[PDB]
Nucleic acid binder design. Structure first.
Lengths: 91, 82, 255, 80, 491, 98, 94
RNA sequence: AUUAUAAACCAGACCGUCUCCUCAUGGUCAAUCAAGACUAUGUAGGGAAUUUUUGGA
């Protein structure tokens, strides 16, 4: 259904998320929430190349994000259309 | 439930300070607390970023537009947690 | 000395298949005037495989008369039922209700069976009383098979029983080692049995799966309702009858 | 900074965290109460300013935060 | 018996035992030991002993600093043992038991020793099980399967299976254990409240229930049907009553299905089957054929036991009595007719020489010949039967010709295979409607009206039994099929 | 593709040595061996040598170690503990007792 | 439960998203807008409820002008995840 | 008297090994004249357009 279900699957991938105010942050996604709250272990910074402000471990509020890019270059999607149907076994 | 809300409720009758979107800080009493963080105060000091500070009797604040709210150090460990 | 026995027996119990390498009966002469019984070297073997060296293990047995000779009794089915075995004596559950299963087409309760370790020419108080308890007015003509067992050889001692025995049984089930003497070797009327592989047979076993309640002493219910599945009957000291030992071991045996 | 492979918010409760807001005012404070909105109550507040270079300081409160205008949360130096 | 070999002929081949050895990195010696020591009539006691004997334990010896621990154990250790304390075999067996029951140790020499067992028990046990299966021996193999399971999941049979879920709590398991209830009973229970009441813990009752509809469980049914005297099909119907979970049940849920004898001594036929998520709940069939033994064939049992057991789930083991009451087999396969030497029948013998021009040969085939007299000349019913390769087609053609000869016309060739029917039609209409003087050849289409029309018109119709059956059914009114005259039921 | 290289090219070359025990009988031989070990050990640890020993068996190890403990206790316990141990002792406490 | 939300699946193809659904189905280039003086181009691939979209072969077009000028910087991007709140206008070009 | 150390089978690519929050679900408890914290199911939902996470840059 939702495209946050796309990023639900991608455990442990390297991204440099463009936030809305404008930032470059290389880090491991881990588990993302259905409100787009991702958890980032290692980090590079840019406060408003761009200067390294010396932080390591971030945890994102899912409101902030503009564009996520470069964890993996794949196309695999659906799930709920399978599960609803194969549970209809006995009435 | 949300623990911060509970904490706020507990601290009804404390000298709570404030900071909004614009930065218009305050410091008066806590009159009442709600699920959405709506607050009312008494004997409230107005110390804005503009410089022209004033002394106001009562004030009510919208919760959504809050950046944060200040609390004293008494309700730190107990009694809200467990 | 109460721990030394059971374990030893269990270890011994591996040599029970061997007890049917040799099998022989001092064969009494045959008589069509009575009903003659047909037991399979398979079922018997299986029973012996389950049994203890020391102890009375004891199922019911079932089957029906073939249309060849309506005097014959083909023993198609053991019905291994709940029991707590003592050495030379046995508590046993009710006549099993077994119309629920398939292949129970008009199966008469033919009788029962047991182990022991003394080759008599009669039934003891341990046995006779038990028999009486089982089949008071439910079936008088139903029979017993003792299987005397000893290293090298098991031998089949079939027995019938007269109506005077049942009466005795009702009273003297509890104690009464002189009463049996009074009663005597009689009335354990030697009955006719054959051994074959020209037929074979199966067990009904408790649906629980655990007929021997030795160490499940608290569970057993002499006049209790139990379900009965078709199944492979378990060895007397099979890990499912022995649960407590395992538990004890777990509660570290190396403190 | 010394902070390990911490999996979730509940596994990093009671840590001295840098916190970031919409205007750019940077914080520091010990994490007390997780939430739906990340209204994370801090043990003590020291907010910092930069004019529109160089960073300033404040110390008024020990605050119940509100999540709306937060950006993200970063560990500074653990307790004990 | 790890290989097959001829000294002079020089032909090598790998057995099943050899394969087993390969896969389960056995030292041939160990395999050999197993081969003799595992035996139709081996028992649990023995099985541990056999494991101990495994010759990846040639270098393991009893040791004084261990001894005390062994002594403490070997009294209470719940597999009975034949050996006595100084023997290393006994020690090994007790270590195995400890491992099964989780008895992590103080005097670490033993613990080091037990480490080895842990890394290599599951292997050896599995190998043994496989061997047993190959042999076809019930007693060990079910017991061996159980052993394997134990090794996998570090607990005994009497240790209640919940234990092997990650998520069930400790208090519950203890309660379950002591209570001395036939586990199956718990599984059977319907209401979570009920479960709570009867888990000595009305707390977590719902959770446990969720974790019982999270447990494998199958109301299997299986009737066999005797194909022929020797052969027996067995129609199994396996229902998967449990609810899957990709954390718990894995990518699939294997189930080593045995068919085994009235005793439970010998395997008859076995198979692994993977129940998948997809399967679960679907009443899903499974068939296999089992030949028989001469004696068995003669006098046959009251049953076998077909027996699913999971390669994981403790006390899964759904065994059912493959009913045999009055399974009266057939009469020893009736005999095939004889081929006499008389292939002289040919395109000469057929009457008019128009029909000679259709065959692209002169003399018929061996079998074709054997039937020709009955087929072509006389106007009576024919069963040919066989054979694949040999011209059924030719025979059919001959029959058709014969029919034509007496001025009959109404032909109906009925093969099932439509894609070959079409071919036949293609190479009949070109080779046949000419020579009769216009006899119309039609493969039936789909829709009934068209077919009817064709029938009304056409002389020869070709039809899939389905289609022609459909056409016929209303024959009391459709009086064209009333007046059909020859029918070549192909295949 | 072949590359033989000898102890010549070793990072720390093996300065080989031997003992050559004259005695025969095991109950004296063992004692002699122990003595030799002590003598070598003494020579070593005076030069700041942190040392390894091997034996044959597990049961031998502890008994050897025990013997050693009840050898230097006579002469000098000092040169194995040496350091004042205000932090070192704490460290020892932390890991030795657990 | 199942019917109340899944009926909105066809609401993509009827409602104002229909265009972008179509685009997604048969990948085509579209002008992609943003809040702070931005212009973006790419072809459509995966589609959601709230404009949290994914594309391919993406071109950003934007300016950093320190002194009354325009400096249209350009860089190639691929397999993004734009948060749908930032999107304003999208349109299927021939 | 008394024995070195050491590696190992098996199910997997047609396939979601793993969720932060609210609502319901039955089983519980802590309780007052009809309401709150916990395990557990995912069968619900998360632009509830404004009090937060989908737009005041």
């Amino acid at each position: 259904m939702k495209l946050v279900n796309f990023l639900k699957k991608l455990r442990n991938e390297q991204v440099t998320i463009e936030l809305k105010n404008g930032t470059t942050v290389w880090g491991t996604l881990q588990s993302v929430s259905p409100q787009m709250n991702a958890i980032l272990t290692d980090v590079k910074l840019t406060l408003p190349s761009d200067n390294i402000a010396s932080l390591q471990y971030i945890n994102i509020r899912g409101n902030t994000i503009r564009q996520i890019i470069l964890p993996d270059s794949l196309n695999l999607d659906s799930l709920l259309v399978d599960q609803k149907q194969l549970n209809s076994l006995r009435r | 439930n949300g623990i911060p809300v509970k904490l706020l409720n507990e601290a009804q009758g404390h000298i709570v300070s404030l900071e909004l979107t614009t930065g218009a800080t305050y410091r008066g009493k806590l009159v009442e607390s709600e699920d959405s963080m709506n607050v009312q105060l008494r004997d409230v000091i107005a110390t804005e970023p503009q410089g022209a500070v004033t002394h106001m009797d009562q004030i009510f604040v919208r919760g959504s537009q809050i950046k944060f709210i200040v609390v004293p150090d008494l309700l730190k460990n107990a009694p809200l947690f467990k | 000395s109460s721990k030394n026995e059971w374990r030893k027996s269990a270890i011994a119990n591996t040599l029970l298949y061997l007890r049917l390498k040799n099998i022989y009966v001092s064969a009494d002469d045959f008589v069509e005037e009575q009903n003659v019984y047909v037991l399979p070297k398979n079922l018997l073997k299986k029973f012996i495989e389950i049994s203890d060296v020391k102890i009375q293990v004891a199922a019911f047995i079932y089957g029906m008369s073939a249309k060849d000779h309506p005097k014959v009794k083909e023993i198609k089915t053991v019905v291994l039922v709940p029991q707590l075995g003592h050495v030379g004596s046995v508590q046993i559950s009710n006549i099993p209700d077994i119309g629920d299963l398939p292949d129970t087409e008009g199966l008469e309760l033919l009788g029962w069976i047991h182990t022991q370790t003394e080759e008599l020419k009669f039934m003891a108080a341990s046995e006779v009383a038990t028999h009486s308890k089982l089949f008071a007015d439910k079936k008088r003509d139903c029979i017993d098979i003792s299987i005397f067992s000893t290293p090298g050889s098991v031998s089949l001692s079939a027995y019938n029983l007269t109506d005077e025995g049942y009466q005795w049984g009702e009273e003297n089930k509890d104690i009464m080692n002189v009463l049996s003497e009074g009663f005597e070797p009689t009335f354990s009327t030697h009955a006719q049995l054959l051994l074959s592989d020209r037929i074979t047979g199966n067990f009904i076993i408790p649906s629980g799966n655990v007929w021997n309640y030795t160490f499940m002493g608290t569970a057993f219910n002499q006049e209790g309702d139990y379900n009965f599945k078709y199944g492979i009957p378990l060895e007397f000291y099979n890990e499912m009858h022995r649960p407590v030992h395992f538990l004890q071991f777990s509660e570290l045996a190396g403190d | 900074i010394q902070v390990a492979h911490s999996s979730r918010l509940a596994n990093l409760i009671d840590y001295k965290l840098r916190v970031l807001t919409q205007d750019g005012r940077v914080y520091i404070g010990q994490l007390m109460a997780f939430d739906k909105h990340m209204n994370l109550v801090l043990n003590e507040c020291i907010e910092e300013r930069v004019p529109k270079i160089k960073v300033e300081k404040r110390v008024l409160g020990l605050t119940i935060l509100r999540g709306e205008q937060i950006l993200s949360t970063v560990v500074e130096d653990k307790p004990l | 018996e790890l290989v097959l070999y001829d000294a002079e002929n020089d032909v090598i081949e790998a057995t099943d035992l050899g394969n087993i050895a390969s896969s389960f990195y056995i030292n041939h010696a160990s395999m050999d030991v197993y081969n003799r020591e595992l035996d139709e009539h081996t028992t649990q006691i023995d099985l541990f002993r056999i494991f101990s004997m495994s010759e990846e334990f040639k270098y393991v010896s009893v040791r004084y600093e261990e001894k005390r621990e062994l002594k403490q154990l070997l009294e209470k250790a719940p597999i009975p043992i034949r050996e006595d304390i100084d023997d290393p075999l006994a020690k090994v067996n007790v270590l195995l038991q400890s491992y099964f029951s989780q008895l992590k140790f103080e005097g670490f020499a033993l613990n080091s020793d037990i480490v080895f067992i842990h890394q290599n028990a599951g292997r050896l046990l599995r190998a043994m099980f496989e061997i047993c299966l190959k042999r076809g021996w019930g007693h060990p193999t079910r017991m061996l399967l159980n052993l394997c399971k134990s090794a996998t999941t570090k607990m005994w049979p009497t240790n209640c299976p919940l234990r092997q879920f990650k998520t069930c709590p400790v208090e519950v398991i203890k309660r379950l254990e002591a209570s001395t209830v036939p586990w199956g009973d718990y599984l059977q229970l319907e209401t979570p409240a009920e479960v709570g009441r009867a888990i000595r813990s009305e707390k977590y009752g719902k959770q446990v229930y969720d974790l019982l509809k999270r447990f494998p469980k199958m109301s299997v049914t299986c009737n066999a049907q005797p194909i022929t005297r020797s052969v027996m099909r067995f129609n199994i119907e396996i229902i998967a009553d449990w609810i899957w979970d990709m954390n718990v049940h894995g990518s699939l849920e294997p189930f080593l299905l045995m068919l085994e004898d009235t005793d439970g001594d010998s395997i008859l036929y076995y198979d692994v089957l993977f129940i998948t998520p997809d399967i679960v709940g679907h009443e899903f069939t499974l068939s296999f054929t089992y030949e028989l033994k001469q004696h068995n064939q003669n006098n046959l049992p009251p049953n076998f036991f077909l027996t699913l057991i999971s390669e994981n789930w403790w006390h899964s083991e759904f065994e059912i009595p493959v009913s045999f009451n009055g399974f009266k087999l057939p009469k020893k396969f009736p005999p095939p007719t004889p081929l006499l030497e008389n292939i002289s029948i040919s395109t000469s013998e057929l009457g008019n020489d128009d029909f000679s021009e259709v065959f692209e040969f002169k003399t018929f085939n061996k079998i074709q010949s054997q039937v020709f007299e009955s087929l072509y000349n006389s106007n009576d019913s024919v069963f040919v039967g066989s054979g694949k390769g040999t011209g059924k087609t030719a025979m059919a053609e001959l029959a058709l010709l014969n029919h034509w000869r007496q001025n009959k016309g109404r032909a109906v060739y009925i093969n099932p295979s439509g894609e070959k029917i079409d071919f036949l039609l293609s190479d009949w209409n070109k080779r046949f409607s000419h020579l009769a003087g216009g006899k119309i050849i039609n493969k039936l289409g789909n829709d009934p009206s068209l077919n009817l029309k064709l029938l009304a018109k056409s002389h020869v119709l070709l039809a899939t039994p389905v289609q022609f059956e459909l056409l016929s059914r209303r024959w009391r009114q459709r009086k064209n099929i009333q007046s059909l005259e020859l029918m070549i039921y192909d295949d | 593709g072949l590359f033989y290289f000898d102890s010549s090219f070793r990072p720390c070359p093996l300065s080989q040595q031997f003992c050559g025990i004259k005695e025969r009988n095991s109950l004296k031989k063992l004692k002699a061996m122990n003595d030799a070990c002590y003598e070598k050990v003494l020579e070593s640890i005076n030069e700041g040598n942190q040392i390894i020993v091997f034996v044959h068996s597990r049961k031998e190890t502890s008994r050897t170690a025990t013997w050693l403990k009840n050898k230097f206790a006579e002469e000098n316990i000092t040169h194995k503990l040496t350091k004042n141990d205000a932090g070192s002792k704490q460290i020892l406490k932390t890991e030795a007792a657990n | 439960r199942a019917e109340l939300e899944e009926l909105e699946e066809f609401e993509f193809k009827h409602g104002p998203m229909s265009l972008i659904n179509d685009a997604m189905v048969t990948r085509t280039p579209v002008i992609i807008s943003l809040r702070n003086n931005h212009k973006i181009i790419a072809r459509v691939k995966a589609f959601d409820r709230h404009c949290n979209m994914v594309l391919e072969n993406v071109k950003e077009l934007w300016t950093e002008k320190k002194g009354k000028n325009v400096i249209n910087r350009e860089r190639f991007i691929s397999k993004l995840f734009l948060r749908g709140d930032s999107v304003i206008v999208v349109l299927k070009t021939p």
